[PDB]
From Swiss-Prot, chains A, B:
A single Gene Ontology CC term: extracellular space
Species: Conger myriaster
PROSITE patterns tied to this protein: GALECTIN
Subunit architecture: Homodimer.
Swiss-Prot/TrEMBL keywords: Acetylation, Lectin
Highest taxon, organism lineage: Eukaryota
Name this protein carries in UniProt: Congerin-2
Residue ranges constituting the Galectin domain according to the UniProt record: 2-134
Record-linked Gene3D superfamilies: 2.60.120.200
Binding positions (a beta-D-galactoside): W68, Q69, Q70, E71, E72, R73, S74
InterPro entries: ConA-like_dom_sf (IPR013320), Galectin-like (IPR044156), Galectin_CRD (IPR001079)
Length: 134, 134
């Protein structure tokens, strides 16, 4: 199915580093941190070609039985199809701090002010090769 | 549910370190490396009190739609209910190499000669607090 880390709580102060490989001919893939596949506090989508979006990062949250909220977009896109990537995420109750493969960072609001998350997963056209959550 | 790391391949040469806490009044808990909850190549059960077994490690494999194979048991048991533990696992095509919190080791045959595993999970009376698989 998708690559999942489930019920190993990602809590305030811990760091999550995932590494993987983008597929050749990838459309998009995302890293999702939340509660379930329908309850995502930080959705980070990497769009190689999706609709009108080409080489952009789109960040958003998904509320259970409600839907996607306000998107934030970033133009920082050090990603290449067929290549490796590595991303580190930490958060406090106000902000998710994300660091990309090249050291550039992107910040996204912790909109629900959650202190722990029990599901981390990747979906779309990429695969994970390692994870550290500590 | 249980603590799971799914579809992030654990391959020949990589190391898996999981850390957690044993519940107070724990009966037993296990760390399972395999393909599914019905297909486990290395089952490591930690028995505080289970039947006639008290403070013993039991290792075995579970074959899909067949069942448990020959058990191997170890008397090394540096575990205390309510306390933390940390375990490191690597394997080659013949052997799973397991290192316990106190540095003692236990070895178990890789009975199917598998080179990669797509499910790592914990079940029973413990919880995981961190994982590194790299
Ligand atoms: O916001 C994350 C969310 O985006 C959806 O796509 C949006 C698209 O970004 C937007 O430009 C357009 O107006 O509406 C689309 C549908 O809501 C994705 O479908 C979804 O998977 C998430 O990635
Ligand atoms: O071997 C792992 C497997 O053990 C089962 O328990 C065994 C028990 O170890 C043995 O002494 C007894 O004779 O038979 C029991 C049932 O097969 C557990 O039930 C199972 O969960 C695994 O842990």
């Amino acid at each position: 199915d998708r690559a999942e880390v489930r019920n190993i709580p990602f809590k305030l102060g811990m760091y999550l580093t995932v590494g993987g490989v983008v597929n050749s001919n990838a459309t998009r893939f995302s890293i999702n941190v939340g509660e379930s596949t329908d309850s995502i506090a930080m959705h980070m989508d990497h769009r190689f070609s999706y609709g009108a979006d080409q080489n952009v990062l789109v960040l958003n949250s998904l509320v259970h039985n409600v839907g996607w909220q306000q998107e934030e977009r970033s133009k920082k896109f050090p990603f290449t199809k067929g290549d490796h990537f590595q991303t580190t995420i930490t958060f406090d109750t106000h902000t998710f701090y994300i660091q990309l493969s090249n050291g550039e960072t992107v910040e996204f609001p912790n909109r629900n002010k959650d202190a722990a998350f029990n599901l981390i997963y990747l979906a779309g056209d990429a695969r994970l090769t390692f994870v550290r959550l500590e």
